[PDB]
Design a protein around this ligand. Structure first.
Ligand SMILES: CCCCCCCCO[C@@H]1O[C@H](CO)[C@@H](O)[C@H](O)[C@H]1O
Ligand SMILES: CCCCCCCCO[C@@H]1O[C@H](CO)[C@@H](O)[C@H](O)[C@H]1O
Ligand SMILES: CCCCCCCCO[C@@H]1O[C@H](CO)[C@@H](O)[C@H](O)[C@H]1O
Ligand SMILES: CCCCCCCCO[C@@H]1O[C@H](CO)[C@@H](O)[C@H](O)[C@H]1O
Ligand SMILES: CCCCCCCCO[C@@H]1O[C@H](CO)[C@@H](O)[C@H](O)[C@H]1O
Length: 257
């Protein structure tokens, strides 16, 4: 059961306060994109010398703020997630960071046990999300969402849906919905210790969207070899309206399950 189940995991108490909880996946991979969006970041010095090969990484942690707030198997929690695109090899430019996306959340989560013809709905999570790239104009992007996260498992499968509703200011990128849509779908499949996964969003009206396929395998007890292939719009905020295909290879700690 407790395999990829975020909320139930947060409920399990740690003896050491400095032992964190994983929310999303944690990885650092060496990537190569098909197109490096220069239009958007043109304001930057290095902009011209921008290379199509960046070190991409994602950090993702959850913090239980208050267990049992709404009954047993409930938690008022927070998570922090950060994706970074880093022109590491771009030595002529002093290895700049092209983009970072800071994504903190505040939610009410529940660990559950509903049945769906084989499936079990394990997580039901409802919260506020903020995602900005901490840039001063013009390369500044930001948007906010009220969201619901639902995860269910059934054998080697995991399915998580995340519908959302936009709230707050969207001026840095008013039309962001046109590229992101109204929800995120995520599928994981366990083939032994190999984990195949897919994560995506798609605005069924505008035809815009994006996908991310992944495959990982344990290098050791805690670290995995991870291969990623992103294609489409919205890889990062600064490229939300930019299309691209990105293949990368690197290491991972936790996968979706
Ligand atoms: C975990 C391994 C990755 C190590 C990366 C080194 C830490 C550098 O840190 C990065 O510096 C950038 C420079 O402004 C910031 O934009 C990023 O937000 C920050 O993560
Ligand atoms: C929409 C609000 C999400 C539901 C979360 C509230 C947590 C309740 O918890 C649920 O209670 C059910 C009893 O009816 C049990 O059958 C489920 O296994 C249990 O997870
Ligand atoms: C299901 C409830 C989840 C608790 C979410 C924490 C929400 C606190 O988040 C708040 O949401 C407001 C939206 O009404 C925004 O205006 C505030 O800026 C934001 O801080
Ligand atoms: C638990 C099942 C819910 C899955 C979430 C999918 C809902 C996203 O559905 C979207 O809702 C929008 C709002 O009206 C519509 O404009 C879009 O056409 C529709 O795709
Ligand atoms: C989101 C990740 C993409 C999922 C595609 C993986 C398809 C899994 O495919 C499954 O493989 C099993 C073992 O070979 C078979 O027994 C099942 O019949 C088959 O559905």
């Amino acid at each position: 059961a407790v395999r990829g189940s975020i909320i139930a995991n947060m409920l399990q108490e740690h003896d050491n306060p400095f032992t964190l909880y994983p929310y999303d996946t944690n990885y650092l991979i060496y990537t190569q994109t098909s197109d490096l969006n220069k239009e958007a970041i043109a304001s930057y010095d290095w902009a011209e010398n921008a290379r199509k090969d960046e070190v991409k990484f994602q950090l993702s942690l959850a913090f239980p703020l208050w267990r049992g707030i709404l009954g047993p198997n409930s938690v008022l929690g927070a998570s922090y997630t950060q994706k970074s695109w880093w022109q590491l090899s771009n030595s002529e430019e002093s290895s700049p960071f092209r983009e970072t996306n800071y994504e903190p959340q505040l939610f009410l989560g529940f660990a559950t046990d509903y049945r769906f013809a084989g499936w079990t709905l394990r997580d039901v999570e409802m919260g506020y999300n903020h995602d900005s790239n901490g840039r001063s104009d013009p390369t500044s992007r930001s948007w906010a969402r009220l969201y619901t996260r639902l995860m269910a498992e059934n054998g080697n499968w995991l399915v998580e849906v995340k519908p959302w509703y936009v709230v707050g200011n969207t001026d840095d990128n008013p039309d962001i919905t046109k590229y992101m849509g109204y929800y995120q779908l995520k599928i994981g499949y366990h083939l032994g210790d190999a984990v195949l996964s897919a994560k995506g969003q798609y605005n069924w009206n505008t035809g815009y969207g994006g996908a991310e396929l992944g495959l990982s395998y344990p290098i050791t007890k805690h670290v995995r070899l991870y291969t990623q292939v992103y294609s489409g719009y919205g890889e990062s905020l600064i490229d939300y309206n930019f299309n691209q295909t990105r293949v990368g290879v690197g290491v991972m700690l936790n996968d979706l399950f």
